[PDB]
């Protein structure tokens, strides 16, 4: 786990040399031949660069806006092809925000319906 150096009497921890799987993140080739490459579980210093928990993503731009997940990367991150168009990375949304108008004397009752 660690070694005490023979001359300095200092202790240094031993980590493995960075490694991990290499994944290609792509839209279907039917609409785009643009790709991004994710180096899983590694630092960007070892390998439009985004460092995340799942690894180093090179090629896609990162944005502030969340979107429903399209093609997942992991650890809260998904990617998509958006406006001209390019591959982007974002924190995934789990759906649109909503609420219930919970007044303590209010009820909603359907007046029409459909059969699906």
């Amino acid at each position: 786990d660690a070694v005490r150096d023979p001359q300095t009497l200092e202790i240094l921890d031993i980590t493995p040399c960075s490694f991990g799987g290499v994944s290609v993140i792509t839209p279907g080739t039917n609409t785009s031949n643009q790709v991004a490459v994710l180096y899983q579980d590694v630092n960007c210093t070892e390998v439009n660069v985004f460092q995340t928990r799942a690894g180093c993503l090179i090629g896609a731009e990162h944005v502030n806006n969340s979107y429903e997940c399209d093609i997942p990367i992991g650890a809260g991150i998904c990617a998509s092809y958006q406006t001209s168009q390019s591959i982007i990375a974002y924190t995934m949304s789990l759906g649109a925000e909503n609420s219930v108008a919970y007044s303590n004397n209010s009820i909603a009752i359907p007046t029409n319906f459909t059969i699906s």
Partner: protein
Amino acid sequence: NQKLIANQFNSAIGKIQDSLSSTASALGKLQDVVNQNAQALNTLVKQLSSNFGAISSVLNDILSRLDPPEAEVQIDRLITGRLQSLQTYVTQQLIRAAEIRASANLAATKMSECVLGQSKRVDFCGKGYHLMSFPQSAPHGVVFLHVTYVPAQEKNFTTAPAICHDGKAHFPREGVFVSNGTHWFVTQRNFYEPQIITTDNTFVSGNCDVVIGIVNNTVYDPLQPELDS
């Protein structure tokens, strides 16, 4: 709404036809079973070309090249490799088959409870309230068409747990008391259709001093006009 319901149903059937139609992704679940089995078979056969430490993966090349004292050793190397490949294959098939065993049990359960009757189980027959379903034949599996009731437009109503009449508390036999801001009605929860609140709709139990949120209204008795007339 029989005319409307029949029209919505007929439209819904056309919609599933178009969804299933040109796009094969809809049936990916059946395609995956076929593909995984094909891959397992292709892998097993390809392994026959491997040496597994032998001088040659071809049994005939060993037999025609080496005398038995050496040929038998090279053959054992191929037997061990090929036998291990079969053992791996069979184990993999038994595990995959166990998944299918479970899926078939679920599919059979669904037909019995979704097609041969109506279950009241949520998300069992797709989304919405289950009415009916129809099975369809499919390659290596079964496709279920689920017909469900889904609420659409909704309206904002005021409610109350009970109506206070003569000091007695009146509760719905079935349904909820609602108000349009001017008048109280009683209706079924899953389809707004307001009724006049009467003694034939509600029942009396307890009183106005013990019901939280009880409101003042008039409960109609269909018998009194008859006694007076």
